[PDB]
Amino acid sequence: NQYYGTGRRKSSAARVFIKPGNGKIVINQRSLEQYFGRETARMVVRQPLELVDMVEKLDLYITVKGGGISGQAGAIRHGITRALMEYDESLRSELRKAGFVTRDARQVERKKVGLRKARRRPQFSKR
Amino acid sequence: ARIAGINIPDHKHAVIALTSIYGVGKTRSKAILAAAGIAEDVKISELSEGQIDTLRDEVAKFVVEGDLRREISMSIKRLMDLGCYRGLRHRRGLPVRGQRTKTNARTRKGPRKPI
Amino acid sequence: PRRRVIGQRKILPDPKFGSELLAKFVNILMVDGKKSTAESIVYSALETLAQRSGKSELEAFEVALENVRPTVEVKSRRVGGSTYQVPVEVRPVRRNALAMRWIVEAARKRGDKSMALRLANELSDAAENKGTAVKKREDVHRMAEANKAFAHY
Amino acid sequence: PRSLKKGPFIDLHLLKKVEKAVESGDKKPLRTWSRRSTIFPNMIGLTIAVHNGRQHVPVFVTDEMVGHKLGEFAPTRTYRGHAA
Amino acid sequence: GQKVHPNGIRLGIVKPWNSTWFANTKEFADNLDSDFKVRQYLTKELAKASVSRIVIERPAKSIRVTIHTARPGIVIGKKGEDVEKLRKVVADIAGVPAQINIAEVRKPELDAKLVADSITSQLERRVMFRRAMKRAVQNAMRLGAKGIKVEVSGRLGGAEIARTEWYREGRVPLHTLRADIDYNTSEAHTTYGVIGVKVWIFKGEI
Amino acid sequence: RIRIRLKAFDHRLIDQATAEIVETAKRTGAQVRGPIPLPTRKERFTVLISPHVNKDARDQYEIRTHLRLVDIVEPTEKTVDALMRLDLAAGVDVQISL
Amino acid sequence: AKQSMKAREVKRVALADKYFAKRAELKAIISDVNASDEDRWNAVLKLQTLPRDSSPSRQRNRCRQTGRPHGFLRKFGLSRIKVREAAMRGEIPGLKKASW
RNA sequence: CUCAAAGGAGACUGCCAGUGAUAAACUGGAGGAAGGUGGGGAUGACGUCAAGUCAUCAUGGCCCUUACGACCAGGGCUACACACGUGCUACAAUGGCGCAUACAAAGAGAAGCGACCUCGCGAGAGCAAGCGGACCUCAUAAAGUGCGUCGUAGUCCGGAUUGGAGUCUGCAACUCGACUCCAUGAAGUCGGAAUCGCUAGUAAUCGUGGAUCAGAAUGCCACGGUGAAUACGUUCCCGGGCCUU
RNA sequence: ACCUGGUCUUGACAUCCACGGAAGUUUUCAGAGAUGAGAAUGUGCGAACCGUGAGACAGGUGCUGCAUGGCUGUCG
Ligand SMILES: [K+]
Ligand SMILES: [K+]
Ligand SMILES: [K+]
Ligand SMILES: [K+]
Ligand SMILES: [K+]
Ligand SMILES: [K+]
Ligand SMILES: [K+]
Ligand SMILES: [K+]
Ligand SMILES: [K+]
Ligand SMILES: [K+]
Ligand SMILES: [Mg+2]
Ligand SMILES: [Mg+2]
Ligand SMILES: [Mg+2]
Ligand SMILES: [Mg+2]
Ligand SMILES: [Mg+2]
Ligand SMILES: [Mg+2]
Ligand SMILES: [Mg+2]
Ligand SMILES: [Mg+2]
Ligand SMILES: [Mg+2]
Ligand SMILES: [Mg+2]
Ligand SMILES: [Mg+2]
Ligand SMILES: [Mg+2]
Ligand SMILES: [Mg+2]
Ligand SMILES: [Mg+2]
Ligand SMILES: [Mg+2]
Ligand SMILES: [Mg+2]
Ligand SMILES: [Mg+2]
Ligand SMILES: [Mg+2]
Ligand SMILES: [Mg+2]
Ligand SMILES: [Mg+2]
Ligand SMILES: [Mg+2]
Ligand SMILES: [Mg+2]
């Protein structure tokens, strides 16, 4: 049947649907190479598949919202990993060994009073 | 390579080369090449004399070079003898468009003059 | 830091070649967080370097590193009286970090057209012990040579 | 400047002052505080005394003063240079 | 240094608001100004009625004022006469139908607003400031407070150099958010200027 | 169908009204859809605390407006008149739409 | 703020309502694209005759409890100082110290 | 299902091993989204500087009362040999310009936000829906990517200054507004002694919003996109904590 | 909140009393305006609301933060 995974990264969240196939990937009704023009983003998306050796045994249906290129690419990689574990449960050990199961919780630090940014202070002068 | 009395560069695109004329910016240079029927990316070197002349008349439609240089000089002249506040700023070399003079204003004043 | 609580950060391997070594070199070259702009510059210079020699992009890159990596450097050491520039052994990781930084710094100083070409001419001279970066490695080895007497402070 | 679809501005109390004196031979100086009034093509001749903050300074309206405001001819600040 | 207001920092945690209506931007500013004039009137009129807290609600085109007090008979009057006299002034001010409810402050020695006002009235009568603060602290500790702190600042005893003095008994853990800390202030207008009083009263963690 | 939109500064007070709006409605015939938790609004304010200067010393406040949506589909006749007379608590804004 | 300065704003608020409709139709004429060229002129001259204090741009928001002309906040009608005092006393509904 | 917002669950050095004074604890491993205060905020002890504020307000005392009170118009707070602080934009090719083409978060709105359509080179105008809003409007994110061009020049870098002509808000833009168009095209080619910020989603860089507000941000407050380098160590510089002399 | 000039004196903002008047709307001239002089229309529902006349008073962003409250910076 269909297998599902929810992935999140920065302000992005990806819905992933995994089913046996031949290796075709759709992201927001576009192809992988059409959606992600950045070469790093394409490698991030694939990374779980090159690891478990199920690259061309599956079909990927994926919708994403929010964030940017690297966030969505990373968000898909997380939800993909959560889909494969709903597929086979013996993959958790090798996926976690690759750092793919962890939800990356790094977010933008808020701007604070008296600072120019989250941490950049205004220029100081003794006199 | 001789328009409006000056010589224009020969190794530059026609749209860039025409901007050497006092009174012709990038917009006017774009209109003239359109009014003459010449592309913008063509170097004026490979422009036939039968085309340069078709640029010279169009440039004549604009007040350029010495005629413009005399109009601008006359406009300022009219403010200075008038005694209006703008002409007093031209007399004293200060900025005329209400900028601060406590600091800055070095374009109108020039480099600093120590006490 | 005082408390020594600083571990290590994982760096992704570069896309085209899967070399973490090369991915750090893109990072040293990157400005303003524009990583893709730096990825392209490195790839173009690497291909000009791959066809200027017979080796692959990596083997030509390593040969450039081997001629720029310093082995010994000098660090100051204020002790009871004054400060001597003590020669210290450069740890294997810092060897690569210094080699890359000097290459990128030397290439930025050249006067060719693009940065991809400048980086290519520096990576090529580094294969022949010419240009800056390689010279910077020579100036460091000389300083550490003239201070070998202070090799116990 | 003021939008063209609105026409130049003129303080109504001044517009009456020029009317009551163009038809007559009143060459007495016109004392006004209305530095915001555009100069119109109808008082080229007589002298309007415009306020600069602490007194009224007479400006002899000619033709070339048309389109300017009155205040452009009554400077408000007094400057003579530092240590000059 | 400066300390956070003990009431404000707990307003959603263990302390309730003193005004509880809802409004959009269109009338939010006008509701605040009418609550201000109402409290300004009630506080002046009922100065001798031991008014601790005036809570204002606005159900629907009407205002409901709840006056917490320790002398409710003084607030109400004979057969509800006086409480009616206010129910008219409040409607005049608020501009809606008014309704007044009288809550009971039992043990006024444990209410920060009443304790602060007690000390302040004593100072305007030229009572020794030291005696007032000790009495207030001993009373509240006897009635079962887990802690109390009283602070008095200004030209105490008409001294030329102003200073601050404070006493404390039991626990007053101001950094614990879930601590029931009743806090209020008051001002005395003596012949030498203003003297400020602050009172913290701890009643147990929730 | 009638639309019920509920506003309040306190999400506990807003759940009391919703619990009793969807209770005085299923009894009186009509059935209910919801309640729906619409996105809470967070209005923020930043003020200078010192009466004079000290620009970097500030307090940051916030008002949270909670929102609720209740759908009374197929309103019976005893249902409608059983709604305006419920008289909800103070500080709960109620807007009735048809 | 001074008492006189407070009374200046109540006058400017009254005069802005008494001449509200009389000001709006005059600007309707002046802004009217297809009016004439002399009634426009008359409407322009007539607008200057109304007292200056009748224009809403002459008003300055003031703290409703102190009269402070700076640090105003429209949602509460108070200066930044009085907003803080009322907020900590719990006299502003829903308003608490924010943190995210 | 993403999400919205209510209620719950979750992390405790709890588990395992070693170490340790049979202690506190520490070092490492497992499981787990998260591991040792998970990240960020709020929260500021006794006190110090007669620190700041009598111009938010309040207030002792002092002082003025046909004036130091009150009303009005115009001017000033925007001056300009100069000196300093904090910023913005640059000096370019990791770029400029042209065309095409992706991916955000957070927020505001009724004397308000204002679509569509038509007119204008443009700022805008006329007409006029929808929205007190997860609905409508503000409102195209920009950096990015593809293709072209420019080819190291004070330039197709830079955009100061000035002339001319306009728009909009407003009784009214002379002093003294913002923005648009055409023309003008300054200094500046990486900055002396010296000096500042930052340890990770940070710095750097890229846009977006809000308060104030008729109009008037390069300031302030807030939001996401991209996204580093380095930390051997504690002798030295600065500030601080504990014991001792 | 400052300057120049034009203006007022129980007063722009409160209370008390006396007397006049519903309050308001609609226009004319003088004046930069403040204001002054008028000229029309309403007179409704004491007490609203205006004008005047007295004197208790009001008014002060005037001085002292080294007389103070409140609030804030700071070591941290
Ligand atoms: K005083
Ligand atoms: K002015
Ligand atoms: K200026
Ligand atoms: K700036
Ligand atoms: K140029
Ligand atoms: K102006
Ligand atoms: K510099
Ligand atoms: K604005
Ligand atoms: K010592
Ligand atoms: K103080
Ligand atoms: Mg950021
Ligand atoms: Mg131009
Ligand atoms: Mg200016
Ligand atoms: Mg909203
Ligand atoms: Mg006052
Ligand atoms: Mg204003
Ligand atoms: Mg572990
Ligand atoms: Mg604090
Ligand atoms: Mg002092
Ligand atoms: Mg001082
Ligand atoms: Mg002062
Ligand atoms: Mg004035
Ligand atoms: Mg200033
Ligand atoms: Mg340019
Ligand atoms: Mg706005
Ligand atoms: Mg030069
Ligand atoms: Mg150059
Ligand atoms: Mg740190
Ligand atoms: Mg920015
Ligand atoms: Mg210790
Ligand atoms: Mg005077
Ligand atoms: Mg002091």
Side-chain angles (χ1 to χ4, degrees), chain D residues 16-35:
Chain D
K16 301 309 113 187
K17 259 198 224 291
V18 288
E19 289 317 310
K20 308 322 151 214
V22 60
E23 48 85 15
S24 277
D26 172 76
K27 292 313 114 164
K28 264 63 62 186
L30 261 55
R31 195 180 67 154
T32 193
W33 297 262
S34 181
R35 326 171 31 102

Side-chain angles (χ1 to χ4, degrees), chain B residues 78 82-85 88 92, chain D residues 64-65 68 72-73 75 79:
Chain B
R78 165 198 173 249
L82 239 178
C84 61
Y85 156 94
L88 264 39
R92 307 180 110 263
Chain D
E64 258 290 344
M65 289 174 177
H68 292 210
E72 321 205 40
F73 301 89
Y79 180 59

Side-chain angles (χ1 to χ4, degrees), chain C residues 117-137:
Chain C
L117 192 43
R118 283 184 272 216
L119 178 55
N121 298 349
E122 192 59 62
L123 277 163
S124 80
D125 289 17
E128 323 297 319
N129 308 48
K130 283 131 47 183
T132 303
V134 170
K135 170 149 131 279
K136 171 104 174 127
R137 191 260 290 124

